Ligand binder design. Sequence first.
Ligand SMILES: *[C@H](C)[C@H]1/C(=C/c2[nH]c(/C=C3N=C(/C=C4\NC(=O)C(CC)=C4C)C(C)=C\3CCC(=O)O)c(CCC(=O)O)c2C)NC(=O)[C@@H]1C
Ligand SMILES: *[C@H](C)[C@H]1/C(=C/c2[nH]c(/C=C3N=C(/C=C4\NC(=O)C(CC)=C4C)C(C)=C\3CCC(=O)O)c(CCC(=O)O)c2C)NC(=O)[C@@H]1C
Ligand SMILES: *[C@H](C)[C@H]1/C(=C/c2[nH]c(/C=C3N=C(/C=C4\NC(=O)C(CC)=C4C)C(C)=C\3CCC(=O)O)c(CCC(=O)O)c2C)NC(=O)[C@@H]1C
Ligand SMILES: *[C@H](C)[C@H]1/C(=C/c2[nH]c(/C=C3N=C(/C=C4\NC(=O)C(CC)=C4C)C(C)=C\3CCC(=O)O)c(CCC(=O)O)c2C)NC(=O)[C@@H]1C
Ligand SMILES: *[C@H](C)[C@H]1/C(=C/c2[nH]c(/C=C3N=C(/C=C4\NC(=O)C(CC)=C4C)C(C)=C\3CCC(=O)O)c(CCC(=O)O)c2C)NC(=O)[C@@H]1C
Ligand SMILES: *[C@H](C)[C@H]1/C(=C/c2[nH]c(/C=C3N=C(/C=C4\NC(=O)C(CC)=C4C)C(C)=C\3CCC(=O)O)c(CCC(=O)O)c2C)NC(=O)[C@@H]1C
Ligand SMILES: *[C@H](C)[C@H]1/C(=C/c2[nH]c(/C=C3N=C(/C=C4\NC(=O)C(CC)=C4C)C(C)=C\3CCC(=O)O)c(CCC(=O)O)c2C)NC(=O)[C@@H]1C
Ligand SMILES: *[C@H](C)[C@H]1/C(=C/c2[nH]c(/C=C3N=C(/C=C4\NC(=O)C(CC)=C4C)C(C)=C\3CCC(=O)O)c(CCC(=O)O)c2C)NC(=O)[C@@H]1C
Ligand SMILES: *[C@H](C)[C@H]1/C(=C/c2[nH]c(/C=C3N=C(/C=C4\NC(=O)C(CC)=C4C)C(C)=C\3CCC(=O)O)c(CCC(=O)O)c2C)NC(=O)[C@@H]1C
Ligand SMILES: *[C@H](C)[C@H]1/C(=C/c2[nH]c(/C=C3N=C(/C=C4\NC(=O)C(CC)=C4C)C(C)=C\3CCC(=O)O)c(CCC(=O)O)c2C)NC(=O)[C@@H]1C
Ligand SMILES: *[C@H](C)[C@H]1/C(=C/c2[nH]c(/C=C3N=C(/C=C4\NC(=O)C(CC)=C4C)C(C)=C\3CCC(=O)O)c(CCC(=O)O)c2C)NC(=O)[C@@H]1C
Lengths: 162, 162, 162, 203, 172, 172, 172, 172
Amino acid sequence: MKTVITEVIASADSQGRFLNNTELQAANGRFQRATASMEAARALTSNADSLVKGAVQEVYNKFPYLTQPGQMGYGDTNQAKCARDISHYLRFITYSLVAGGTGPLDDYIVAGLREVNRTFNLSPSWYIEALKHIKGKVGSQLSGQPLTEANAYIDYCINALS
Amino acid sequence: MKTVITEVIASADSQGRFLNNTELQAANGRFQRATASMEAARALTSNADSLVKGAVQEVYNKFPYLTQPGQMGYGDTNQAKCARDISHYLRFITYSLVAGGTGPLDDYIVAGLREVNRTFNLSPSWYIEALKHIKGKVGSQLSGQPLTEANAYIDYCINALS
Amino acid sequence: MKTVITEVIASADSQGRFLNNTELQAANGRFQRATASMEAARALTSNADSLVKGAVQEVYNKFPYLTQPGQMGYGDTNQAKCARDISHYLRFITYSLVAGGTGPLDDYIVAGLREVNRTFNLSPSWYIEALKHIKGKVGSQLSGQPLTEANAYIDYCINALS
Amino acid sequence: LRPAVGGTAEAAAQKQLGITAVAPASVVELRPNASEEDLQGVLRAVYRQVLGNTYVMESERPTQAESLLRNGSISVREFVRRIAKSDLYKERFFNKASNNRFIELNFKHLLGRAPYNHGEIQEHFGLYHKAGYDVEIDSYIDSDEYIETFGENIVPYFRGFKYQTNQSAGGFPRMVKLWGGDAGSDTDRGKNGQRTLVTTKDL
Amino acid sequence: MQDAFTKAIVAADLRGSFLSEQELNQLTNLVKESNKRLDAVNAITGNAAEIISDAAHKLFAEQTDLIRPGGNAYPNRRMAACLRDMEIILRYVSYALLAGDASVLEDRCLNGLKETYVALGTPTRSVARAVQLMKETAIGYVNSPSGVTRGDCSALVNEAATYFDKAAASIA
Amino acid sequence: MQDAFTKAIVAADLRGSFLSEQELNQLTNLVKESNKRLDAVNAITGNAAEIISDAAHKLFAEQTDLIRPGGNAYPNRRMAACLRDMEIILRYVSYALLAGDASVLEDRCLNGLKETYVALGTPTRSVARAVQLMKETAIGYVNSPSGVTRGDCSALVNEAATYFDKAAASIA
Amino acid sequence: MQDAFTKAIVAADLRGSFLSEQELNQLTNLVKESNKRLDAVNAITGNAAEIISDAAHKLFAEQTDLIRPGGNAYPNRRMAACLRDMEIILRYVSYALLAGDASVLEDRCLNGLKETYVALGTPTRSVARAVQLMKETAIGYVNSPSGVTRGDCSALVNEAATYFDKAAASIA
Amino acid sequence: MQDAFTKAIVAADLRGSFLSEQELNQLTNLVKESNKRLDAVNAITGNAAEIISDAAHKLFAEQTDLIRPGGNAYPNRRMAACLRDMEIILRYVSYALLAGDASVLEDRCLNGLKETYVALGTPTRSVARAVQLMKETAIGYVNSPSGVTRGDCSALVNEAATYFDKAAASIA
Ligand SMILES: *[C@H](C)[C@H]1/C(=C/c2[nH]c(/C=C3N=C(/C=C4\NC(=O)C(CC)=C4C)C(C)=C\3CCC(=O)O)c(CCC(=O)O)c2C)NC(=O)[C@@H]1C
Ligand SMILES: *[C@H](C)[C@H]1/C(=C/c2[nH]c(/C=C3N=C(/C=C4\NC(=O)C(CC)=C4C)C(C)=C\3CCC(=O)O)c(CCC(=O)O)c2C)NC(=O)[C@@H]1C
Ligand SMILES: *[C@H](C)[C@H]1/C(=C/c2[nH]c(/C=C3N=C(/C=C4\NC(=O)C(CC)=C4C)C(C)=C\3CCC(=O)O)c(CCC(=O)O)c2C)NC(=O)[C@@H]1C
Ligand SMILES: *[C@H](C)[C@H]1/C(=C/c2[nH]c(/C=C3N=C(/C=C4\NC(=O)C(CC)=C4C)C(C)=C\3CCC(=O)O)c(CCC(=O)O)c2C)NC(=O)[C@@H]1C
Ligand SMILES: *[C@H](C)[C@H]1/C(=C/c2[nH]c(/C=C3N=C(/C=C4\NC(=O)C(CC)=C4C)C(C)=C\3CCC(=O)O)c(CCC(=O)O)c2C)NC(=O)[C@@H]1C
Ligand SMILES: *[C@H](C)[C@H]1/C(=C/c2[nH]c(/C=C3N=C(/C=C4\NC(=O)C(CC)=C4C)C(C)=C\3CCC(=O)O)c(CCC(=O)O)c2C)NC(=O)[C@@H]1C
Ligand SMILES: *[C@H](C)[C@H]1/C(=C/c2[nH]c(/C=C3N=C(/C=C4\NC(=O)C(CC)=C4C)C(C)=C\3CCC(=O)O)c(CCC(=O)O)c2C)NC(=O)[C@@H]1C
Ligand SMILES: *[C@H](C)[C@H]1/C(=C/c2[nH]c(/C=C3N=C(/C=C4\NC(=O)C(CC)=C4C)C(C)=C\3CCC(=O)O)c(CCC(=O)O)c2C)NC(=O)[C@@H]1C
Ligand SMILES: *[C@H](C)[C@H]1/C(=C/c2[nH]c(/C=C3N=C(/C=C4\NC(=O)C(CC)=C4C)C(C)=C\3CCC(=O)O)c(CCC(=O)O)c2C)NC(=O)[C@@H]1C
Ligand SMILES: *[C@H](C)[C@H]1/C(=C/c2[nH]c(/C=C3N=C(/C=C4\NC(=O)C(CC)=C4C)C(C)=C\3CCC(=O)O)c(CCC(=O)O)c2C)NC(=O)[C@@H]1C
Ligand SMILES: *[C@H](C)[C@H]1/C(=C/c2[nH]c(/C=C3N=C(/C=C4\NC(=O)C(CC)=C4C)C(C)=C\3CCC(=O)O)c(CCC(=O)O)c2C)NC(=O)[C@@H]1C
């Protein structure tokens, strides 16, 4: 998984060199950001049930037809799959916060996303609408550098879906 | 583009060989099919205006929301762009019939399709619904080997969108 | 083995694509030619014993020295090897007719031909004289498209020897 | 007239070994004024050969590099060197693997053959330790072997499974240990991870 | 690669003989049914995306485990690779159906597959289940095409069935 | 690559129009004469070795200097390269004759040829004379095939002539 | 690659769960002691050449046989390779100390090392002795850096010790 | 690579000693017979095509099966490969005769040859028979060179014999 620490080590290994002050400075940056990142991660974890339920309902408000019969939103299995998917997104966002890189999100969600979504006919727009809902609620929960960290990982997902 | 003739020539060139009976037999298959393919192409050309009008209306029936304000189906510009796009699809289908390959469809439509559709937020499902409408109407207009040819090129598009 | 069918499959596999109308049209050309090709193949098979005898004799008339002692024509083993070789040529021509490609001839005869002929001091001109004798006799036996098919595979060999 | 008793067909050995698609491997050349269809063929060939039939998701495609190839700003040879220096290559074949495994992977990917002797291992391990990864990858791409066979426009293809001029005898059995099949790959994503197929004991 | 015609001549060569009249007759019969064969190959190609999608939905409904965390089809990377594999197998079955011989499937697609799956830890029996689901969908399309002249396609359907079955047997 | 059909489509696309009935008619005529075209392509392929040899004999009789020491064909290596070039040109002309368009000849063979020859020091006018000699031999084979149905092949002969002439003009 | 944080995420993912408070606490403690860790990594890098040199001198005093003719360190080429190996192992131990996980050491350095050594005829027990000699030197530098704030580094030293010990156990 | 001189040095190095006068004397004897050795290497190179041809004729007379349909030297592709292999082995024997040591033959030709043949399904015993047939032809040329000073070449002939014999024993 890409993190600040793995990336500096990988670079050094490619050059075949011992880690220098250049790498260690980068490493220090990761460890300082960690306090804000942890704060974000704890808050997202604490509100995760509420965040997901609101997110799913927002998708249904934004696209009313999904809930209508013969549509992807209709039926318990379909609705359950929605809540599962948004929960995955939150989980991988909190993992990325704690890891100090986008690598968790990249390996679990971003790779293969487009192919999967095409085959199953899952619209990127539904997910993007849910993530944007989350971003609004998180903004109420967190402030300052915690908030900045949270917003960046949510934005990474939104851009990958886009 | 890809046609039977270009493909046999390309194969021979790759092996650095003069064209042999193997290639010429393949070529003869293209020239025999040409009569059915031409008949299909003429019929699609004659009904192209009507085919496009019906196809666009079908999309609006299948997804009623699009027609509502703030949606992609709404407004003259948007509706005009729909008719343009479906017309393009027909034009490249008739070209493919005459060319004796899917190459015209591949170079004009299929290449870059996914990236374009993503950026402009154009759903593959709208196009697929229009193509399927056309396929039904073509079935009334053509029979036998002409019909077989037509259906194959419409199906190629549908699979590429899918 | 190069045939129309293997060549279309190979092309599709290289592109990583399903067989489309382009390939199927080519395939249809192979199956239509098959009736002429079969007729040729049956005629060559029926007269194969006589064709070989006349071919071997023609070489001896064309190159009288070979029959004289200390020469490649002289002796039972040498004459038997001649009849064997011409028989091989006819056999692989009939195989190529039935296969719908030059592939049988290419793998069995053409590949390695030059190196083998050099090492064993076998003149390409002897074989070419035999093939041309066959071509004249076949011309009496076959007409029209059967004749055209036969002539193409005999000519392929003549060019490979040349 | 009577046939040979054993009586295999030509190609029987290739059929039996499962090298039937690669023993005489098809050669793909990027040509001038290449069509879009033609360029896509070359790219597929490159990814299969250079990345060891591992899957590449659409997010991983280089795209900017392909822009150059389409333009003619770079040759197939330069494109191959960019892929081999890329993190797509490094992640699979280099970061998890040992040098011993990395070196033989490079021969298969770039040269199309197995390492012929322990001296090739000694040379490339030595280069890496003195000059790091990029210099190493350059060695294969900038080598008489590369340049004479593929040159600039030909995509690398599998040369082993056929006799090459300076080949050692150990070369063909070693290619058999490196080739898993058409469906094989050289994938980091396994239970055991990247292990050495060709031991020092072998070399 | 091999096709039905190529297979017959290779056999005749090992006997060292001109193709027999019986062998010729069998080949002639293949030519007579070639139109139907072309129609069958068309049916698979025309519905290829539908075949894979329908199979995928059925597989994941049957086996929830694969899509859960810890499953081989989780996460998106793996799911994508799974769908890629299904498409590859279908492509090679269609190739084999045009050839009239299973060698193309065996030599390229099937070769090394079980070893790959064992290394990955992919469950082979699930892969086999996927191939069976694809088979049922595909055969339906062949059996019920639009605009095709009615006749008996039973022999072609049976041949298609065997190619699917070969793939399944190899994988597990 | 391009062929006659593909060329017409590209033109119509730039107009953004469905192919016109006149354009369709031209294409229909190409299909109508396709058997004659196939015969002509066969004649060149079937006599390819003879065409090159007969041209080579005539060229070296006309220009004794090339084969003398100091001539461009003078070591065996150079003579071999000369014969290779003649084979390549004939190959591409035959490709163009099947395609019905000279694009393949221009794009792969002819582009940069004169520049390469000038750098090498190969005499371009002699290369052109070789292409003209090949043309006369080739046309003879097309004009007198054995067992072909008697008919007028004049348009196809003229088309072949133009492809030879294009090659000659580019090289020179 | 894996680091301490990455390892915890992977575990939680297999459970399909958000990181637990206990898991979070462990990670937070690693962040809290990160300054000490950075100082220790710096000590190895800053003294890297001395660590290897001091070890090498001690190894060759202990084992005269390696440097005599017939020893594995005996021509200059082999001596150079021995010194190269010591530097590589030290590099990977230092990487592991920054990561907080031994994976990097295992995945590149340790995998197949014993097999390679046995094939070469390198004596594995001596290689292990070299790793122990490096350990004593390296730990001394970590334990006594100059101008660092006085503090207890014992946990970090123990972690470093384990990485050295892993390498030794694999090799021998 | 290794030669007779290089082999002696390597031995003395492992003892860590200067080459002894007796060892020097052996090397001097090799230098003394070097003209004869050069003539022997010349005889093989000068008659190389004849050696292979004469062997091949004898092999195919002895083993009719190889050249019959289905045989390992049938058809032309396989026959060509067989002749290529014979030439490669002869090349390496000639290299070894100049070197005065079999290592080049062992390291590059012989190691893995048997494995290759077994994988291919080539009959190793026939390959070995081919090497014996080549030996008889080659030795004849060495024994009767044209215009060379008359002398006893028997020791060199025996050395050549051993290299052929090693190759045969490895392959079989
Ligand atoms: C919610 C916004 C909408 C919705 C979603 C929904 N999803 C599926 C099916 C799938 N969802 C995924 C997604 C993931 N799988 C992963 O491994 C990851 C990364 C960790 C994600 C995010 C997948 C792969 C599937 C397809 C296979 C499966 O069933 O698991 C469906 C069902 C589609 C189907 O027919 O298969 C639905 C409906 N549900 C709603 O109502 C919203 C509109
Ligand atoms: C019809 C089903 C729906 C619809 C469509 C619509 N399309 C666009 C925009 C584009 N359409 C295309 C497609 C093509 N361009 C080509 O070059 C070809 C191949 C030759 C095709 C088929 C493109 C590229 C665009 C984007 C650029 C452009 O504007 O030309 C729009 C507007 C998209 C936007 O938001 O900007 C629309 C709405 N309209 C409807 O009513 C249906 C829902
Ligand atoms: C007939 C025109 C002349 C002739 C023939 C002759 N042939 C050979 C030897 C060989 N011929 C072949 C040919 C083939 N073997 C194959 O596998 C195939 C493809 C299926 C072919 C076409 C080969 C390989 C040989 C060499 C091996 C062998 O002996 O079988 C000879 C013997 C040459 C020698 O010096 O050994 C002869 C004499 N003889 C005549 O009377 C004609 C002049
Ligand atoms: C889907 C039905 C099941 C599934 C599939 C799955 N496959 C892989 C990985 C690979 N699949 C292949 C297969 C092929 N490559 C080819 O070119 C061919 C044809 C010649 C085949 C059939 C390959 C080579 C790989 C491994 C290398 C790679 O990275 O692609 C995976 C990924 C496993 C992983 O751990 O990442 C998966 C998931 N798995 C299931 O559970 C489904 C039942
Ligand atoms: C079997 C899978 C189903 C079926 C097949 C079927 N097809 C025909 C007849 C024809 N099939 C074709 C089609 C093609 N010819 C080509 O050149 C190509 C590739 C470009 C195709 C796809 C043709 C030309 C014919 C003959 C003319 C016609 O349209 O009838 C039949 C009729 C019998 C025959 O073999 O002639 C049949 C039975 N029909 C079914 O009911 C099956 C479900
Ligand atoms: C023969 C009629 C005349 C002749 C020819 C000649 N050509 C060369 C060398 C080259 N010729 C080419 C040309 C081509 N290469 C291609 O790929 C194509 C199609 C695009 C062609 C037609 C090239 C590239 C070379 C140089 C590289 C090579 O030889 O492979 C020579 C040799 C010149 C030299 O000194 O190397 C000759 C002699 N020369 C005559 O005098 C004839 C009239
Ligand atoms: C012009 C070069 C000479 C000529 C040509 C000519 N050809 C035909 C007829 C046919 N030619 C073919 C040949 C092929 N069809 C194929 O499928 C292949 C490749 C596998 C070939 C080579 C065929 C099938 C025919 C039609 C059947 C027939 O035998 O007539 C004609 C007849 C009329 C027509 O225009 O097709 C003619 C005139 N005739 C000459 O005199 C020229 C010297
Ligand atoms: C020094 C303490 C001891 C010693 C070392 C020694 N090593 C070699 C040769 C090699 N060592 C390696 C090691 C690695 N391969 C890897 O991938 C890694 C991690 C990335 C390492 C550390 C390798 C590959 C070789 C073989 C290739 C080469 O020699 O370059 C030797 C040389 C032995 C020989 O005969 O070639 C030696 C001497 N030997 C001792 O005696 C010391 C106790
Ligand atoms: C243990 C190895 C020895 C030791 C370490 C120790 N260090 C600190 C404090 C700090 N260490 C650093 C160093 C760095 N931070 C960076 O960003 C980099 C790389 C770019 C380095 C090298 C820093 C910033 C501090 C804090 C400032 C300070 O001077 O205190 C301590 C104090 C505890 C703490 O974690 O803050 C200690 C104990 N000291 C010993 O006695 C050990 C032998
Ligand atoms: C001739 C006396 C016998 C014979 C030979 C034969 N060999 C092959 C194929 C191969 N031969 C080799 C051998 C070498 N590779 C090496 O590295 C060396 C020396 C260092 C040798 C001698 C190789 C690698 C191959 C495979 C590659 C290739 O085919 O080019 C064949 C062909 C087998 C096939 O079916 O392809 C044959 C026939 N066979 C006989 O019958 C004779 C006894
Ligand atoms: C043994 C294989 C047969 C034989 C050999 C033989 N040669 C000589 C003498 C000489 N051989 C050469 C030849 C060469 N010297 C070179 O530099 C080269 C390569 C460039 C060759 C080929 C020379 C120079 C001599 C000496 C001068 C001379 O002509 O005598 C002898 C004589 C003894 C000796 O070598 O001093 C012999 C015996 N003669 C036989 O009877 C064997 C069948």
